[PDB]
Design a protein around this nucleic acid. Structure first.
Ligand SMILES: [Mg+2]
Ligand SMILES: [Mg+2]
Ligand SMILES: [Mg+2]
Ligand SMILES: [Mg+2]
Lengths: 284, 442, 442, 284
DNA sequence: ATATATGTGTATATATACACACAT
DNA sequence: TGTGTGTATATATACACATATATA
C-alpha cells in the first residue's frame, strides 16, 4: 500500500519480476511509459540512503526509504529471504567447453536468460551422471549457471535492479549504501538478484549517432580520441533523457553484484565508525 | 511615531481593489492577441534573449526562469519555473512555444521533473507564427523589458488551451486545432463566413463532441471476449495517479472489478475484468451508459472565454469565432504598421547606401581629397555640402578597404538593389502580405 | 539483455573511490591558493560575468546562481544559492568578497533571507585582492569555464574561516585578521622571521587567547550591583536562538536566574538578576569561574589546516604560518608568468601600432594606391611581403579617420607609448611587482 | 509560548507593548536587532492568511497561524476583549483649540502619546465641569483620542501592528485578511489597537536623496515629477538594508484602523462566498 | 562512551486564495 | 457541498561526511 510504489502486473506471482529503485520522483516519471508492464516495478527513493551498517534491526525500520523498500520487496530483516531445495542429484552440462556441474533443480544461463534445469531434463542434451560431494560452488557461480531452486519465498519482486543517476553522488554514495543495506541478506548477492542498471552519464553527438559513456572516468579516457563531440552531461537519471530512457530500459546493460570472501571488511572500511581506515584507503 | 486613523473602507477601496485588478489583468487572464499570461511572456522573452547567439542551444530551466527579475518580474522565480515548465511539453500543448529536452511530463505523469535537470529553448513554432517581434507595443512601465504583447499571426490563445483564476473573474479556453484556427483566420482575412475552429486535444485519441456550449470529451473501451475490457483511452482530465485511485481503486476493493495495467506507449491501457458481482446486462445501450458513467469515460467542459484585449481591459466573448474575427482586425492594423515602418526604414537605408556609393565614386576619382586633414575640417566640409550632412557619420564607416575596386561595384549594387525592396514595400497591401505570411505555417 | 558480472571489490575501488576523492577535492577542503571551494569559485565566476557589463549593479541571488550550470557546475542551483548567501555577510566574513543588498543575516539570527529578496554583487575587496585572472591556469575539463583557481595577493583561506567535511578528511581554519595576514605575506616576500597571524572574529568584542596551541574565546560579563549582572558578550559560536534555549532557558526553568533581553545594536546584552537559589560565593576566582562555566561564556577550539595545493592534491599543515610561506612562494611564479606574458603582449601591440603608423604614412603619400585596384590583389600587393606583412589584414581593416593629420600623429604617439610600456615591463621583477600590488590593500 | 516568538520583556505587564506580525521568517531577521527590547513583540506568519469570514470558531482555531496569534496576544475567540470601567462624567477641555468632550477616565493624545485623565489631574491645565446632557459618545470615539480606559485586560500585548510587505499581495490579500480575523474583536478597533506599519515598496534614490513610496500608486503619481531615478523595488521586507529597517521600526508611520458602521457589509463583499459582489465592486 | 555542529551535496513537501461549471 | 485547475505568498524535512569539545 506504498503511495509511490508502481506495482507490476505479475508482482507477487512466480515470474521474473523486477524492482527499479531510483533516487527521486523525477527519475521515475518516464518509467511508467517505457517499462514492461508484466515484469517491471518501481519505487522512488528520497535522496541519499541512510548508512545502515552496524545498526540493529530496529533503527533501519525507521527511515522512510528503508521500511518502504523492506515492505515492497517483501523482505524482512533478520530472516532468510530464500528457501533452497534438496541437493542430491548431480549432472553435467558441458557449455562452451567448461565442465558445469549442475543439480537436479538449478537455473542455467543461455545468453543472459534464466531457464530451469528440471525442465531441461526432458531432453537429453549433455546430462552426465556424476558422484556426490562435487560442491564446485565457485566453479559454476562465476557466470551463474546454478541457482538453487527456491522452495518458498516471501519476495514479491524476484529482482532488485537498482538504477540511480550516474554522477558521483548517485554512484559512490547511494550505490554502496544500498549495497550495504541489501547485504543484510547474503543470498541476494548469490543468485544475481541485485543488479545495477547502467545509466549514461555523458551522451556525445559525434557524426549523426549518439555515443554513450556510462561513467565520467570512462569518458575521460577517450575525450581526446573522439571526433567533434558535443556532449551532454546527464545529472539526473530520468530527467535529462527523453527517448534514451526507453532504449536504456528496453535494452538494458545490467551488472549483477557478487560479494567476495571478505565483503564484511570492505563494507566496514567504506561504511564504518572508524574514519582512519578511509584515510588509508583513499591514499593508495 | 505617527498616528493616522485609516478607515477600513479606504483600505478596501484602494489596496484590495488594486490587488484584485492586478490579479485580474497581470496574473491570470491571458492576452487575446499574444496568448500569454504576464509570466509566460517573461519566460519567452528571456528564452528568446538567451537564443541570441545560438538558436538551437538548450538552456537550463533554472537559467531561463532564473534571472527574469531584470526583465520586470516582481514575483518569485519558482512561479516562473513552474510556468515555463508547463508550456514546453506536448502532453498539454497543441502548439508548443518552447522545445525542451528532459522529463517535462507525460499524460500518465502530468508533472514535469525538477528544474535542476530539464533544459528548454524557444521552439520553431514561435519563429513560425510570432512575427514582427520588434514592432510589438511598448509597455507603459520602464522596467517591463518585454513588450506589451507579442504579435502572432494566428491567435495562440485558442491553441494551447488556458485556465486562469483571479479575484472576481476567471477564464477557461479549450485547445483548438491549428489547421482549423488557420482556416478561420484565412477566411476572416478576405471577408467570408468564418468557419468555427474544431476543438482538439494534444496526444488524445477520443471524441470531443459539442452539443450547445458544453463539450463531451469521451474515452474508448473494447470488450475483449465477454467480460474483459480494454480501456484504450481515458478522458483528458485524468492523470494515471488520479485514475487508479479515483475510479479504479474504488471499483476493486468493493467487489466489482479486477484491473491490470497495459498503459503502453500509445497511451492509457487499463485492462479490466469484471467479477460476478456486477449489474451489466445484455442491452447494449444500458451497458454503454453504465460503463461510461461508472468508469468516468465522459468529462464535461464549458469554455469561459475571458481575455485581456489590446486595450489592456478585460473582455468576455461568447464564441471563439468572435475572438478570431476581432483578432484578425487587430492584427491587420499592425501589418500596416509593419508596412509603414519597412517603407521608412528602406528609404533611410537606401539614402545612406547612395551617399556611401557617391563618396566612394567621388573620392577614388580625386574630388573630395582627405589627405592632410583633421576630424573637424572634414566633418565641416562634408556637412556644408548637401546629401552628405545627414549621414556625416558615414565618412569613416566604410573603412579603408572600400576605397578600392570590387567595393565600388558592391557599394553601388547595394544602393541599386535597395530600391527593389523599397518598391516592393510600396506596393504590397495588408491582405496580400498577410496571405503570404499565412502560407508558411505548416 | 546484457547481464554482466561486477565484483563488490571492483565497485568500492572504482566508483566509491571516485566520490570519496571528489568530496575531498572537488568539494569542501578549500584550495590553498584560490581560497574557495568549487561552488564558491563558480558563484564568483558568474558574478564576474554579470559585473562585466556593470560592476556596481546588484543582481538577484537567483541570478548570481542558476546561471552557473553552463559554467560547469552540475550540482543543483540551491546549493549554489546557499553557498553564495554565506559569502556576502559581514557578521560571518572577516573579508567579504561579495557585497549584499537585503537581509543576508546577523549574528543573533545566522540565516539569510530567501533568495527571492537578497541581491549580491562582487565586492571591492575581490577587485583589490584578486588579480591576474586572465593568467590563471585553465582546468583540464573544457566544460569547466572558470579557471582552475583564481590568484589573490593574500591567502584568503586564512581570512574568513572555513569548515569543510568530506569522506576521510575534514578542515577547520579560524578567521584571521586581514592586517596581520598582509603583514605576514609582506614578511614572507622580503624574507625574515614571520609573525604568526592573530585570530580575529568579525563583529565580536571579547577575548581570544592562545593556550597550548588551542584557541579559547571568552565573552565579557560585568556586575552592576550585588545581584545584577550584564552579559556584554557571548562566544562567537552562539546565536540568540541557541543561547536563550540552551543556556538561558535551562537556568530559568531551574529557578536560578531571571534574564531581560538587550540584544540590540551592541550585539548580545542579556541582563541577569540572580536568585537566592544560585550560589554567589564572594571569592573572585571561584565566582568568575562559576559564572564563565555556568553561562557558557567560554568556547575552546582547535584548528585543522587541510587545504589543496597548486597541484590539486590534499595537503595538511601544522603551523598557522606555514601556508603563507608556501602560498607566497607559489604566487611569485604566477606573478613572473604575468610579467613575461605582459612583455610579449606589449611588444606585439607596439609592433602592430608602429606598422599601422608606417602604413598610414605610406598610403597618404601615394605609395599604396588603393584607388583603381581590387581588394584581393591589394592584399597580395605591397601590403603583404613587406615589413607590415604580418598584420596585412589589420592595415586593410583600418578606417578613414587615420589618413587625416589629426589621428596620423595619434597612431605614432600610441606606437611610441606602447614601446615605453614595454620598457617598463622589461625593467621590473617579481618581488617589486608583488610588493607594489600588496600596497593597494590598506 | 510558540517557537518563533520574540517576546518583549514587558509583555505581561502594563505598558505600550506592541506585537509585530510579518508574513514570513525572512522579514523578521532584522527586527530582532532594531526592536525596543522592552516594548515590541514578533511572530512570523506563513504566507496568505486563511479566510476568516464565515468560519466557526472551532474551524477558526485550526489554521496554525490563527491559533498561534490567538495564543500569543492572549485573545480568546468567542469571549469579548478587555472590559471597561463605569462612565458618565464629563470634563471637557480646550486642547488643540477645540472643545473635546472627555469622560472621567479616558486616554488623551497630546502629540502621538497616551495620557489619562487621572494623570492629567496633576498637570494643572483647564478643567470645565460639564453635566451629562450630552450623549454624542461617537463624537470622540471616531477619533483615536478620548478612548475608554481599561480595568482588566487578558491581552498580553497592548498593541497589534501588522507589518506585511507593501507589494500587491501583502496589502491586498493578507492585510485585509488579518483585518477580517481581528474584526472578531471590534473593541480592539474602537480603541485604536490594530495598526499597520507603513513599509516602503519602492525606495528610489535621486542623486543622494532617497524617496520612500509605500504603494505603487504613489510612485506612479510622482513618476513624472522626480529627476532621473534608479528605482529599487523591494519585493519583501527581507530585501531591506538594516539602516532602512531600523528607520522603519524606530521611526514608524502607523495607520490605526477604525471600522465604520457598515463594516460587516463591506467585509461580506470582499471575503464572502459570492463572486458577483466582487464583480460589481471591481467594475467601478 | 556518546551528542552536537559545521557546510556542500541527494531528493522531497506543505497551507493558503481565487472562481466557475460538473458531480452530488 | 466538494475536488479541481494555475499563478502567487510564506515555509519545512530526512540522509552522508569528521573531529574536537561537552556530556555520561
Ligand atoms: Mg532523480
Ligand atoms: Mg545525481
Ligand atoms: Mg507579501
Ligand atoms: Mg516578507
Amino acid at each position: 500500500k506504498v503511495h509511490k510504489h508502481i506495482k507490476a502486473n505479475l508482482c507477487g506471482k512466480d515470474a521474473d519480476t523486477t524492482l527499479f529503485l531510483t533516487e527521486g520522483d523525477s527519475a521515475i516519471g518516464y518509467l511508467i511509459d517505457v517499462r514492461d508492464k508484466e515484469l517491471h516495478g518501481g519505487y522512488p527513493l528520497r535522496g541519499k540512503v541512510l548508512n545502515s551498517w552496524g545498526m540493529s534491526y530496529a533503527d533501519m525500520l525507521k527511515n522512510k526509504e528503508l521500511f518502504d523498500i523492506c515492505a515492497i520487496t517483501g523482505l524482512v530483516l533478520g530472516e532468510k529471504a530464500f528457501e533452497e531445495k534438496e541437493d542430491g542429484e548431480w549432472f553435467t552440462f558441458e557449455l562452451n567447453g567448461d565442465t558445469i556441474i549442475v543439480n537436479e533443480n538449478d537455473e542455467v544461463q543461455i545468453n543472459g536468460k534464466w531457464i530451469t534445469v528440471g525442465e531441461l531434463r526432458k531432453n537429453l542434451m549433455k546430462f552426465v551422471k556424476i558422484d556426490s560431494s562435487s560442491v564446485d560452488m565457485k566453479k559454476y557461480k562465476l557466470q551463474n549457471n546454478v541457482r538453487r531452486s527456491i522452495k518458498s519465498s516471501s519476495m514479491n519482486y524476484a529482482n532488485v535492479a537498482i538504477m540511480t543517476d550516474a554522477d558521483h553522488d548517485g554512484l559512490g554514495s547511494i550505490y554502496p549504501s544500498l549495497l550495504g543495506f541489501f547485504s543484510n541478506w547474503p543470498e541476494l548477492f548469490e543468485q544475481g538478484r541485485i543488479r545495477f542498471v547502467k545509466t549514461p552519464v555523458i551522451i556525445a553527438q559525434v557524426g549523426k549517432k549518439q555515443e554513450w559513456f556510462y561513467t565520467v572516468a570512462e569518458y575521460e579516457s577517450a575525450k581526446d580520441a573522439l571526433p567533434k563531440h558535443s556532449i551532454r552531461y546527464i545529472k539526473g537519471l530520468g530527467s535529462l533523457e527523453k527517448s534514451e530512457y526507453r532504449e536504456m530500459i528496453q535494452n538494458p546493460v545490467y551488472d549483477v553484484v557478487k560479494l567476495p570472501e571478505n565483503w564484511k571488511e570492505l563494507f566496514e572500511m567504506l561504511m564504518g565508525d572508524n574514519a582512519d581506515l578511509r584515510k588509508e584507503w583513499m591514499s593508495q | 511615531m505617527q498616528l493616522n486613523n485609516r478607515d477600513l473602507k479606504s483600505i478596501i477601496d484602494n489596496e484590495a481593489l488594486a490587488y484584485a485588478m492586478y490579479t485580474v489583468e497581470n496574473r491570470a487572464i491571458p492576452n487575446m492577441i499574444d496568448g500569454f499570461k504576464p509570466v509566460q511572456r517573461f519566460v519567452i522573452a528571456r528564452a528568446l534573449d538567451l537564443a541570441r547567439g545560438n538558436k538551437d542551444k538548450f538552456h537550463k530551466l533554472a537559467s531561463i526562469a532564473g534571472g527574469v527579475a531584470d526583465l520586470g518580474y516582481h514575483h518569485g522565480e519558482n512561479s516562473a519555473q513552474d510556468a515555463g515548465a508547463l508550456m514546453a511539453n506536448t502532453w498539454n500543448n497543441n502548439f508548443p512555444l518552447l522545445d525542451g529536452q528532459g522529463n517535462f511530463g507525460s499524460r500518465t505523469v502530468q508533472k514535469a521533473a525538477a528544474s535542476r535537470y530539464i533544459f528548454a529553448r524557444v521552439s520553431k513554432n514561435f519563429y513560425n507564427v510570432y512575427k514582427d517581434t520588434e514592432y510589438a507595443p511598448v509597455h507603459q512601465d520602464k522596467e517591463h523589458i518585454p513588450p506589451a504583447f507579442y504579435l502572432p499571426i494566428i491567435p495562440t490563445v485558442l491553441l494551447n488551451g488556458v485556465s486562469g483564476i483571479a479575484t472576481g473573474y476567471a477564464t477557461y479556453i479549450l485547445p483548438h486545432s491549428v489547421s482549423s484556427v488557420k482556416k478561420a483566420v484565412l477566411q476572416a482575412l478576405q471577408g467570408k463566413k468564418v468557419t468555427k475552429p474544431k476543438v482538439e486535444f494534444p496526444e488524445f485519441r477520443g471524441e470531443v463532441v459539442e452539443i450547445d456550449g458544453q463539450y463531451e470529451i469521451r474515452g474508448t473501451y473494447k470488450f475483449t471476449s465477454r467480460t474483459q475490457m480494454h480501456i484504450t483511452e481515458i478522458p483528458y482530465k485524468y492523470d494515471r495517479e488520479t485514475y487508479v485511485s479515483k475510479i479504479l481503486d474504488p471499483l476493486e476493493n468493493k467487489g466489482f472489478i479486477t484491473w491490470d495495467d497495459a498503459c503502453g506507449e500509445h497511451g492509457f491501457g487499463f485492462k479490466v475484468k469484471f467479477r460476478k458481482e456486477y449489474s451489466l446486462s445484455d442491452n447494449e445501450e444500458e451497458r454503454h451508459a453504465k460503463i461510461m458513467k461508472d468508469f468516468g469515460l465522459i468529462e464535461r467542459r464549458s469554455q469561459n472565454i475571458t481575455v485581456i484585449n489590446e486595450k489592456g481591459k478585460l473582455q468576455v466573448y461568447d464564441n471563439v469565432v468572435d475572438l478570431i474575427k476581432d483578432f484578425v482586425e487587430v492584427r491587420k492594423t499592425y501589418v500596416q504598421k509593419r508596412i509603414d515602418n519597412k517603407i521608412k526604414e528602406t528609404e533611410s537605408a537606401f539614402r545612406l547606401a547612395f551617399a556611401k556609393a557617391h563618396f566612394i565614386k567621388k573620392v577614388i576619382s580625386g574630388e573630395i581629397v582627405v589627405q592632410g586633414k583633421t576630424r573637424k575640417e572634414l566633418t565641416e566640409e562634408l556637412s556644408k555640402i548637401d546629401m552628405y550632412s545627414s549621414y556625416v557619420d558615414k565618412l569613416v564607416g566604410m573603412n579603408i578597404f572600400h576605397m578600392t575596386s570590387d567595393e565600388a561595384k558592391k557599394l553601388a549594387e547595394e544602393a541599386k538593389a535597395k530600391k527593389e525592396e523599397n518598391e516592393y514595400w510600396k506596393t504590397t497591401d495588408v491582405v496580400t502580405e498577410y496571405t503570404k505570411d499565412l502560407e508558411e505555417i505548416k
